[model samples]
Target: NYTRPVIILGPMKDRINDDLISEFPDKFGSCVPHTTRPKRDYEVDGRDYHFVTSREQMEKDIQEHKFIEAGQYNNHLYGTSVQSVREVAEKGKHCILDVSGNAIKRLQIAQLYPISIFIKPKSMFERAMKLEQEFTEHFTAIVQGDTLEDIYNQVKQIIEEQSGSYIWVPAKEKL
Candidate 1:
C-alpha cells in the first residue's frame, strides 16, 4: 500500500485544496502535474507544474503510461503523474488530487484508493442525484453547504476522521 491516502476532490465548486494545504501543509499535499508550457517568470519547475519541455516528451511519457491523466487544453498538454502523487506520500503527506470525474476512475484503477469527494451545488441537483447513482460505485464522500467555509469544514472533518484509520474500500478498488 502507498504511504499516504490519495483524497481526490472534484467536479469541484471551489478551492478546497488551497484552503486545506494552507491550513495543514504537513497533513495534505497535492500532486505536481506536468505541462507542455514554458515556465512563467514567477514560477519554478517542480513547483508550478513539472514544466515538461516539449510536446514530444509529454506525448511520449503520456503514451508510455507515466501519466495518471493527460489532456490538451488551450493548445497545451497538461497532466498529473502517478509518480508525483506517490512522491507526495514519500514525504509523509496525504495526497490531494484535483481531478476530473474520468480521472477519478483512472486514479482508482491505479489502486491508490482515492477518497473522492464531490462538492455539491444547489443547481447540481439533477446531475448530483444521477451521479450518486453512477458514482456510487466509486464515490467516497459528497460534501454540500451554504458556504465554502461550511463545505471545507465538512471535507476537513471527513479527512480527519478517516485518516490514521482504515475503512474497507470496495474489493474492486483494492483487488
Candidate 2:
C-alpha cells in the first residue's frame, strides 16, 4: 500500500510532514532519532529514540559518519542513525527522514533507496538553492505549485503512484 523510503527537502518540509502524517497515517512517519540521553518515562526505546546507553558507541559512530544529523545537547549525543531509518522502513512504512542537506547524500550512500522530493518554485529559498544545486539531481522529482494545496495534491499523486510503480535504483545496492 506504500512505497520506498522518502525524504522531502526545502523550507516547506515541516509543513509537508504535518500534512502527510494525517493523509497516510501508517504509510508515512518521521524517522526516529537516537540519543545517548537517558530514556524518558513515556518514550519507549526504539519507539522514540533508539535510546543508546553507550556514550562510547555514539561517539565512535559519529566519527564514522554513521548518522544522518548528529549533534550534542546538554553535553550528550543526539542524532538520527542510518539504521533507525531502515529499521522503521522495514515495518511497511515510507520512513520519512525530515532532516536534510547532507542527509540527502547519506541516504544515497546507505542505499536506503529513498524517493527524495524537493518542493521548489513554491518554496524556493537561497540556502535551498545550494541544497538544490548539490542534491537536486539526486531527487526523484521536483514539485512546484502556486500554493500548499497545489503542492500537496502533486505530492499525494506521487505517493499514491509509488506503491504500484517501479523505480530504477543503483544496482550496487542489491549487493
Candidate 3:
C-alpha cells in the first residue's frame, strides 16, 4: 500500500540493502548481480553479492537479457536482475531497490513497475537560493546533544528498521 521512498538523515548502509530486498523478496533478499575485483572483509556471501568470476560473466548476462539493468558504477559493475526482481514479487513481498542512474534509465524502457527515487547532492544548488529567515532560524537550529548518544540511538533505530519499520527518526525521544 505504501510505495513511497522515505528520506533519512544520511545515506546509511542497512537502509539501502533492506530497500533492495524489500522490493525483490523472492531472490533470497539478495542484491542484483554485481562485480567486484576484491571483496571486503566485512562482506558476507549471498548477502552483499552473489559473487561471480569475470566482469565478462556479468556483462554476458546483461547482453543476453539476464538483467533488468546493468552498468559500470564506481569503476565496477552493478546491476539488477529482471528475473530476481520478478522472483522477489512472486514471493509476496515488496521490491524496493537502489540502482545507478544508468540502471534507472534502462529500467524505464523495460516497462516494469519501478519507482525511481533519484538521490542527488543538492546542497550547492539549494544553499544558494535560501530565504533569510529560512536559513537563519528554522533550518540551522542547533540541538544540544552528545554526538555519542545520537550514534547509540541510531544503532537502536536501525535495528527497528531492519525488523521492518522501513523508516526512523531520532528526533523526539533522543537528546
Candidate achieving the largest TM-score: 2
Give candidate 3 misplaced runs (Cα > 4 Å).
Answer: 1-30, 100-111, 115-175
Clashes of each: 0, 0, 7
User: What's the lDDT for residue 81 in model 1?
Assistant: 90
Model 2 poorest ten-residue lDDT run? 161-170
* lDDT for each residue of candidate 2 in 66-93, tens digit (9 for 90 to 100): 8878999998899988877877677777
Q: Give lDDT tens digits, candidate 3, residues 96-123.
A: 5554334443444554444432222334
Answer with 1 or 3, whichever has the higher TM-score.
1
Better of 2 and 3 by TM-score: 2
lDDT of 1 by residue, 38-144 (tens): 77799988887888777998889899888778888889999899888878866767787766666677666776657677776766457566666666666677887
Kindly indicate the candidate among 1 and 2 with the higher TM-score. Answer: 2
Query: Which residue runs does candidate 2 get wrong by more than 4 Å?
Result: 1-3, 122-124, 162-175
Give residue 50's error in model 2 in angstroms. 2.4
Question: What TM-score, to 2 decimals, does candidate 1 have?
Answer: 0.77
> Candidate 1: where are CA atoms >4 Å away?
1-13, 122-133, 165-175
Q: Which candidate achieves the best lDDT against the true structure? A: 2
Every candidate's lDDT: 0.72, 0.77, 0.46
lDDT of 1 at 43: 95
